[PDB]
């Protein structure tokens, strides 16, 4: 072949819908996940990628372990985003909930609706995952949020929003998929 080690790829999936897709630690790698121009597309990840990015969706699902540096989200609505990671990133967002633990603090821009909630996800290899990065399952600022969008109120800015205790729960089970 030409080369063997060197520099980080890159690979993902896009233009999909309504389509599955699932990969495991020996597939990824350590790798960055580009996922754009998709809709009902629901990605059950399962290891430790390099860096997550999810931007132009809709409608999708996304579930993977605690990310390595952090993810992006940008272009997404109605979707749900489900990763821990150290710092969140998100830009001309509305309507999409995105469920994880940050360690250090979360930024938002010129988006309106936004959910942030705790990270909460089983696994044979859930906690174990978090070893990997190195990244603590207590310590989280979620309810810390940077806003970038004032000018009528005077009190807060109606960007970001914390979700009740009634729909924690999300019945991922369809019925004939069991995991």
């Known amino acids: 072949?030409?080369?063997?080690?060197?520099?980080s790829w890159v690979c993902g999936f896009s233009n999909l819908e309504s389509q599955v897709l699932e990969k495991r630690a020996s597939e990824?790698?350590?790798?960055?996940?580009?996922?754009?121009?998709?809709?009902?597309?629901?990605?059950?990840?399962?290891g430790n990628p390099n860096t997550l990015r999810l931007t132009k969706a809709h409608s999708c699902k996304l579930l993977c372990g605690p990310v390595s540096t952090s993810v992006f989200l940008e272009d997404c609505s109605d979707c749900v985003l489900a990763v821990a990671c150290q710092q969140l990133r998100i830009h001309s967002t509305k309507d999409t909930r995105i469920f994880l633990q940050v360690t250090s603090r979360a930024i938002v821009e010129?988006?309106?609706?936004?959910?942030?909630?705790p990270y909460t996800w089983s696994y044979p290899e859930i906690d174990k995952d978090f070893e990997s990065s190195g990244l603590d399952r207590s310590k989280n600022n979620w309810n810390d949020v940077d806003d970038f969008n004032w000018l009528?109120?005077?009190?807060?800015?109606?960007?970001?929003?914390?979700?009740?205790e009634e729909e924690r729960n999300i019945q991922w089970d369809s019925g004939p998929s069991s995991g």
Do not use: K
């Open 152 to 164: 009528a109120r005077d009190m807060a800015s109606p960007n970001w929003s914390i979700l009740p």
């Open 110 to 117: 010129d988006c309106s609706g936004i959910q942030f909630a």
């Open 28 to 46: 990824l790698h350590q790798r960055d996940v580009l996922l754009t121009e998709l809709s009902n597309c629901t990605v059950r990840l399962y």
């Open 1 to 7: 072949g030409s080369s063997g080690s060197s520099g």
